[PDB]
Design a protein around this ligand. Structure first.
Ligand SMILES: *[C@@H]1O[C@H](CO)[C@@H](O[C@@H]2O[C@H](CO)[C@@H](O)[C@H](O)[C@H]2NC(C)=O)[C@H](O)[C@H]1NC(C)=O
Ligand SMILES: *[C@@H]1O[C@H](CO)[C@@H](O[C@@H]2O[C@H](CO)[C@@H](O)[C@H](O)[C@H]2NC(C)=O)[C@H](O)[C@H]1NC(C)=O
Ligand SMILES: *[C@@H]1O[C@H](CO)[C@@H](O[C@@H]2O[C@H](CO)[C@@H](O)[C@H](O)[C@H]2NC(C)=O)[C@H](O)[C@H]1NC(C)=O
Ligand SMILES: *[C@@H]1O[C@H](CO)[C@@H](O)[C@H](O)[C@H]1NC(C)=O
Ligand SMILES: *[C@@H]1O[C@H](CO)[C@@H](O)[C@H](O)[C@H]1NC(C)=O
Lengths: 152, 49, 49, 90
């Protein structure tokens, strides 16, 4: 009877330890993938290497574990702006290559997604496609056209 | 029956800690999926999208 | 969470003008103690029977 | 039931109402801000604008959406009607 009791205790301990081994293996695989992506490069996966736009992580040694010092990129101050998806210059609709059209109330600029860098609406950062009567919302403006003043 | 359970009280201690472990592990599962944001964003009354 | 509403419009955008570099702590356990258990010393003491 | 033999069922910490409130907050965030609310403060943005950026992420230029925005909107509504009908039929 003492034998069968001791075997029952060892069997339940072995089952518990093997379940903890499975959990530790899952956590180890997650930590290895996190190291190989966030640490050994920059990961495009959003909200995987911390809250925000991930830059890099600094791994540090831990007793029976590992920690990651992620470097994120979160915006702090934002400003409201009036935007338009296209610009009608001469019947040709201008669309931004990488930015977005914004206006401060009087004039219009094009700025990047995660930072406010106003620039003059020019040909180098815009491309034309089709006619003007194709977008439900469009506004009238002009293009700076950096070839016209230099040919004179 | 309860007098003879004291010889196996350690087995129930592992079991109650296991079931409590699953129950608290289950409560945390809903927190890791649905509670991604800490601010409730209200739906705007304008439905013109 | 905080009950707030986001002003939505078909011609309104928000472009950030400043950023803050934040560092987030995440804890992952990868290891635990390695133990070895034998029956002869645990189940039995110093008896051949 | 299954509780007469001491097999008590512990109620969940989060009920179905706040889980629905969790989803609706996420739904409002992803239609009014896109992904800015998931990586920082929420930034207001038009949905046709946001649809163009998702198109830019898959190698498609954003100029094609505004040409046929009514077609994509009708395709989205028909797809929503289709999944609602398919889920009605386990
Ligand atoms: C909106 O932006 C325009 C373009 O930068 C601003 O116009 C300029 O404002 C500066 C500030 O005094 C003047 O020195 C320039 O002469 C202006 N240029 C033109 C072409 O007008 C305008 O002031 C801004 N408006 C607001 C409300 O911020
Ligand atoms: C933007 O520009 C277009 C064309 O330059 C304007 O369309 C003209 O509108 C006037 C009166 O509104 C008509 O007499 C013309 O026949 C239109 N021309 C074309 C080519 O459509 C449009 O009105 C302008 N939008 C704003 C808000 O000023
Ligand atoms: C962006 O935010 C940072 C952080 O607050 C600003 O840096 C502070 O600027 C004020 C005034 O210029 C200083 O008194 C603080 O000492 C700065 N703090 C740090 C940590 O450098 C920065 O000025 C902001 N930029 C803009 C354009 O608003
Ligand atoms: C911009 O203005 C709108 C209303 O005009 C307001 O709801 C919004 O909060 C403003 N944005 C900021 C960043 O203050
Ligand atoms: C935005 O929506 C309002 C309300 O429906 C409408 O009056 C306005 O014309 C719309 N603007 C654009 C650019 O579609």
């Amino acid at each position: 009877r003492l034998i069968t009791g001791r075997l029952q205790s060892l069997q339940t301990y072995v089952t518990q330890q093997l379940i903890r081994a499975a959990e530790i293996r899952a956590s180890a695989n997650l930590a290895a993938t996190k190291m190989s992506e966030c640490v050994l490069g920059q990961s495009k996966r959003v909200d995987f290497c911390g809250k925000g736009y991930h830059l890099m992580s600094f791994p540090q040694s831990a007793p029976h574990g590992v920690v990651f010092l992620h470097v994120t990129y979160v915006p702090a101050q934002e400003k409201n702006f009036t935007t338009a998806p296209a610009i009608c210059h001469d019947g040709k609709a201008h669309f931004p290559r990488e930015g977005v059209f914004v206006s401060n109330g009087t004039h219009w600029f094009v700025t990047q997604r995660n930072f406010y860098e106003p620039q003059i609406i020019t040909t180098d950062n815009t491309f034309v496609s089709g006619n003007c009567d194709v977008v439900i919302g469009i506004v009238n403006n002009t293009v700076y056209d950096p070839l016209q003043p230099e040919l004179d | 029956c309860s007098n003879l359970l004291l010889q196996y009280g350690s087995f129930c201690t592992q079991l109650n800690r296991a079931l409590t472990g699953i129950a608290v592990e289950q409560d945390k599962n809903t927190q890791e999926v649905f509670a991604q944001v800490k601010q409730i964003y209200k739906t705007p009354p304008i439905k013109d999208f | 969470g905080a009950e707030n509403s986001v002003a939505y419009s078909n011609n309104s955008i928000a472009i950030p003008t400043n950023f803050t570099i934040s560092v987030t702590t995440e804890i992952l356990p990868v290891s635990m103690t390695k133990t070895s258990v034998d029956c002869t010393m645990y189940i039995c003491g110093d008896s051949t029977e | 039931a299954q509780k007469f033999n001491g097999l008590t069922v512990l109620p969940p910490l989060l009920t179905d109402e706040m889980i629905a409130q969790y989803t609706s907050a996420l739904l409002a965030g992803t239609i009014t801000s896109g992904w800015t609310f998931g990586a920082g403060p929420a930034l207001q943005i038009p949905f046709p604008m946001q649809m163009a950026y998702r198109f830019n992420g898959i190698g498609v230029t954003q100029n094609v959406l505004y040409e046929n925005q009514k077609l994509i909107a009708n395709q989205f509504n028909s797809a929503i009607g289709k999944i609602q009908d398919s889920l009605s039929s386990a």
